[PDB]
Amino acid sequence: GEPLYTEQDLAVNGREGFPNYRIPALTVTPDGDLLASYDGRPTGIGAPGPNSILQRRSTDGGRTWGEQQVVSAGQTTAPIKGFSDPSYLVDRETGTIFNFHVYSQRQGFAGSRPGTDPADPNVLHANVATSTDGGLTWSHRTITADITPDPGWRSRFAASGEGIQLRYGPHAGRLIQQYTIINAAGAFQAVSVYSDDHGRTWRAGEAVGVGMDENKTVELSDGRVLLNSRDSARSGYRKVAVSTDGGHSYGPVTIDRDLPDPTNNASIIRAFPDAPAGSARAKVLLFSNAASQTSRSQGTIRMSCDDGQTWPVSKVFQPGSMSYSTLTALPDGTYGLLYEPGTGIRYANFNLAWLGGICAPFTIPDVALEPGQQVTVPVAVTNQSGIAVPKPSLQLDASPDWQVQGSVEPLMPGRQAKGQVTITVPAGTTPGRYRVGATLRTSAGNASTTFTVTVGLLDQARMSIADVDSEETAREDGRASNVIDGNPSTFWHTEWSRADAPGYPHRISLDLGGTHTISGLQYTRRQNSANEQVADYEIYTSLNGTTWDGPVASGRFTTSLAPQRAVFPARDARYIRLVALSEQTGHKYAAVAELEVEGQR
Ligand SMILES: CC(=O)N[C@H]1[C@H]([C@H](O)[C@H](O)CO)OC(C(=O)O)=C[C@@H]1O
Ligand SMILES: OC[C@H]1O[C@@H](O)[C@H](O)[C@@H](O)[C@H]1O
Numbered sequence: 001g002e003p004l005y006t007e008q009d010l011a012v013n014g015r016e017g018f019p020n021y022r023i024p025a026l027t028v029t030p031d032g033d034l035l036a037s038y039d040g041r042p043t044g045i046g047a048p049g050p051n052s053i054l055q056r057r058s059t060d061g062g063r064t065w066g067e068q069q070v071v072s073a074g075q076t077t078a079p080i081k082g083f084s085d086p087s088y089l090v091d092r093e094t095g096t097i098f099n100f101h102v103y104s105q106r107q108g109f110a111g112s113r114p115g116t117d118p119a120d121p122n123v124l125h126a127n128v129a130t131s132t133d134g135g136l137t138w139s140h141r142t143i144t145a146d147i148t149p150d151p152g153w154r155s156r157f158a159a160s161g162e163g164i165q166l167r168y169g170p171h172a173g174r175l176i177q178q179y180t181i182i183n184a185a186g187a188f189q190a191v192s193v194y195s196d197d198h199g200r201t202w203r204a205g206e207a208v209g210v211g212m213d214e215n216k217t218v219e220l221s222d223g224r225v226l227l228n229s230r231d232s233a234r235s236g237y238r239k240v241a242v243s244t245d246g247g248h249s250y251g252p253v254t255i256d257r258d259l260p261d262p263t264n265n266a267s268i269i270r271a272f273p274d275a276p277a278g279s280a281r282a283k284v285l286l287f288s289n290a291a292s293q294t295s296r297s298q299g300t301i302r303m304s305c306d307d308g309q310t311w312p313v314s315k316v317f318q319p320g321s322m323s324y325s326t327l328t329a330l331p332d333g334t335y336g337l338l339y340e341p342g343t344g345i346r347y348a349n350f351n352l353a354w355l356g357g358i359c360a361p362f363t364i365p366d367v368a369l370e371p372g373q374q375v376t377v378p379v380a381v382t383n384q385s386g387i388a389v390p391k392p393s394l395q396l397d398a399s400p401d402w403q404v405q406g407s408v409e410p411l412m413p414g415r416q417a418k419g420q421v422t423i424t425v426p427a428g429t430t431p432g433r434y435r436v437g438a439t440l441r442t443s444a445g446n447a448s449t450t451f452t453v454t455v456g457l458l459d460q461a462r463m464s465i466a467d468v469d470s471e472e473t474a475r476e477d478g479r480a481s482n483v484i485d486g487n488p489s490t491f492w493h494t495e496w497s498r499a500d501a502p503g504y505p506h507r508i509s510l511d512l513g514g515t516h517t518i519s520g521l522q523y524t525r526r527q528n529s530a531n532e533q534v535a536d537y538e539i540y541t542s543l544n545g546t547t548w549d550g551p552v553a554s555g556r557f558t559t560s561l562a563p564q565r566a567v568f569p570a571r572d573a574r575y576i577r578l579v580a581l582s583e584q585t586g587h588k589y590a591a592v593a594e595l596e597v598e599g600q601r
């Protein structure tokens with residue numbers, strides 16, 4: 001139908017009683033009012049700031065909003081109290097509404113100490129406010145002692161946004177609110193807090209993962225409970241896990257590389273929460289987060305039509321600053337989106353037509369070629385839409401100097417479809433790894449994927465370390481072999497945990513796995529520290545590993561975070577060596593995240 005996307009600020013920093021507003025929670029009451037909840041932060045900080053939990057209501061479906069009310073009032077006079085980080089949870093069977101949030105006194109999350117006694121000021125308490133009148137009035141309780149079965153859990157907070165009620169399985173009706181805890185080793189873990197008696201009693205299930213943080217659960221088409229987490233170890237992606245016992249416990253936690261995230265909250269919901277179990281509609285998820293890995297920006301909505309296996313459809317809702325966001329399904333079939341644009345709290349409303357997607361995830365493999373060559377790669381489309389598309393097309397977003405064309409056969413319900421992409425890379429094309437975007441376009445919506453075309457770079461998987469002067473292995477993973485694993489987050493670091501480690505020069509030599517015509521090397525510095533950066537360098541090559549030729553190139557690298565090229569006339573070699581002569585400001589150590597070799601495979 002007709003696309004819809006509108007926005008309207010609900011709180012602006014400096015207005016209506018608070019210098020700063022943060023942390024959105026959004027839900028729909030049983031009578032169909034929208035509730036938006038968020039912190040007022042009189043001092044601009046999270047707990048233990050003397051924060052209040054606030055609420056505005058719309059009775060006209062999101063179009064207009066009432067006065068800002070206090071759900072739980074902070075206290076800036078003694079005794080100091082703060083209430084922060086709200087999460088709504090509606091019990092749709094009894095009509096009760098909950099709003100989970102912290103109760104701080106002297107400590108926030110990081111500083112909370114062990115114990116569950118409400119009168120202990122050094123505990124970050126888990127509160128819930130409860131409303132039986134559609135969010136007009138609230139009672140308050142502290143449930144910390146009910147959700148702390150391990151006395152080692154010295155801190156917790158409900159992940160702000162919106163919790164769920166299971167519709168399926170032996171635990172249908174269960175209320176589930178996600179928490180993060182800090183255990184006795186200082187690890188951040190996720191856990192589900194839940195009630196099977198409509199919120200009279202709450203407990204914690206079993207904690208899962210390390211490097212966890214604010215996390216969210218959603219009931220999948222078969223009643224499994226998918227957990228999606230912010231990654232406090234900052235991979236640049238969401239972490240995921242799944243429960244088969246209604247959120248009591250979760251399996252292994254993995255990194256989901258389909259969901260970039262810059263370490264920030266996010267939400268995931270059923271698109272059709274009333275859909276019957278096992279149904280095509282019950283497999284549809286929407287996800288909201290910041291898609292940049294480096295900043296809270298690029299607010300993106302994604303859609304999965306297969307219980308979160310793939311996310312074929314995505315659209316930007318906020319190109320600029322976008323921190324926390326939380327989705328809720330509205331009764332008129334659109335979606336509410338409450339988020340942080342940097343100026344407070346903002347409410348967006350959109351529909352599936354705006355999203356403009358088709359449930360047709362598809363793959364194109366990565367491929368490698370030389371400058372001046374042409375390659376065709378197969379496309380495979382899994383049509384999940386349940387509809388036929390006679391005339392699909394495939395549009396590629398590559399460097400304009402390349403000639404790139406694609407096609408794809410007619411979509412049939414419940415079928416795989418084949419296509420092809422032909423990529424021609426003019427000669428002279430700068431060696432590197434090039435992201436190409438692909439869009440499957442149809443009259444019924446679009447889907448996308450990407451794939452990488454490697455031009456003029458040798459195969460790292462065939463390489464190995466021939467030698468290195470020095471490497472730290474004891475106090476971190478600085479193995480020389482980290483330069484060729486293709487991961488920009490791992491690095492070679494020269495040894496530093498002993499005093500008798502060497503300064504510069506340092507040296508790392510690669511076996512290319514065979515003889516290749518090569519003409520360059522590309523260096524990528526350590527991304528997360530400044531003082532082990534290679535500066536003056538020489539490059540050598542060799543046919544046997546012992547008689548080195550050169551320097552074939554020499555120079556001084558800069559502090560750029562991007563690959564830096566060192567080129568030399570084409571020559572046949574089985575090994576290449578980088579001698580790092582100096583560090584940028586004369587420090588003792590070298591670190592390198594990646595080395596690529598420019599040459600023909
Ligand atoms: C309870 C409170 O601390 N929650 C805060 C949360 C938390 O500190 C972090 O997620 C732990 O790693 O951080 C942030 C944030 O914008 O990043 C906002 C929340 O208000
Ligand atoms: O002292 C050497 C160390 O310096 C630290 O700050 C850094 O995290 C380590 O990678 C190592 O370089």
Ligand code: NA
Nearest residue numbers: 482487490593
């Ligand atoms: Na690496």
